[PDB]
């Protein structure tokens, strides 16, 4: 399965970094610290090609992890899940790892294909974890930059 290596920055230009074994946080980084951005492997999965939506999976290129959405106490939750890197990416990716990549207002939105109207989100505040959210004050828009280095 062919995928693209990228970094993601929210609509407030906050970069995404690892803060734990299974956690990401969003914060503004100085230009010289741009290399700290977590590297995603975005793969295109077999699925629902509705007008303006494309099914994707988001792996961490440098870890045996994928973003997935599950329920915890009736609440849709984002998590980083350990996988065996040799079996991934899969064309038929498991439902929990599927995100609908939405292109709107020249930006990216990642909706859980498991939880409609739930998106990969960041808070306005500095250095808070990345989560599943979406009235409201959550940031759901991102820009994708390609990895060259």
């Amino acid at each position: 399965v062919r995928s693209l290596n990228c970094t993601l920055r929210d609509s407030q230009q906050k970069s995404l970094v690892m803060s734990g074994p299974y956690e990401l946080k969003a914060l503004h980084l100085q230009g010289q610290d741009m290399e700290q951005q977590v590297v995603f492997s975005m793969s295109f999965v077999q699925g629902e090609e509705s007008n303006d939506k494309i099914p994707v999976a988001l792996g961490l290129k440098e870890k045996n992890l994928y973003l997935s959405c599950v329920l915890k106490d009736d609440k849709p939750t984002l998590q980083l899940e350990s996988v065996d890197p040799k079996n991934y990416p899969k064309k038929k990716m498991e439902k929990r790892f599927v995100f609908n990549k939405i292109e709107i207002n020249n930006k990216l939105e990642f909706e859980s294909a498991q939880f409609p109207n739930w998106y990969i989100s960041t808070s306005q505040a500095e250095n808070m974890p990345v989560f599943l959210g979406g009235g409201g004050q959550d940031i759901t828009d991102f820009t994708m930059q390609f990895v060259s280095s």
Partner: antibody
Amino acid sequence: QVQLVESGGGVVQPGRSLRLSCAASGFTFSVYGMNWVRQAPGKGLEWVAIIWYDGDNQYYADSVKGRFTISRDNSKNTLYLQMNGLRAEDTAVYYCARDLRTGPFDYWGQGTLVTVSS
Amino acid sequence: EIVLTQSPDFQSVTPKEKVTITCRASQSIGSSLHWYQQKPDQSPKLLIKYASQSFSGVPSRFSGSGSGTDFTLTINSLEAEDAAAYYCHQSSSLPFTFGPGTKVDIKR
């Protein structure tokens, strides 16, 4: 330029405790993960512990899990290692090392020798 | 925990020789495998990051390749100063681990 300077090594009795320090300069210390790696005389490198950039999380090797405590102070650009229940096996040169994206250890200190003996 | 093994334990190399040393992971680690150099009573230094990517200031003779479980470090024309211990380290998952190392010396 990136500089890492360890201090605090010395001779310690087994069962007692010792604090290691590692002062950083030449980079934004508050946004990089920091690690301790040790090497016993004539042996291979052994990863000891990691502390993520903000210090809200850490991780230890099984060999030191529970006996050792990794910490940092971002205002003083300093990395710490608190060693308890020190034993003869703990005799090693302790290096502090910065990691890039929780990946490679890109910059290393000069190391501090910890001697555990009666 | 992911275990790393290195082959050989010791390598004798004539200066100007192209030399290759290996590192094997007990589980698939993608490309999250790093190479370090360590001279005796000297601090280790990073050579190659993420299997095959260069690190600033490292001489061009050092080269890495591999993915999954099998990794190699190449010294394209060994120089006298290259006699040292060579370690691989994985960052795919916690706890982080180092391989046992390969000691490279000068053949005569």
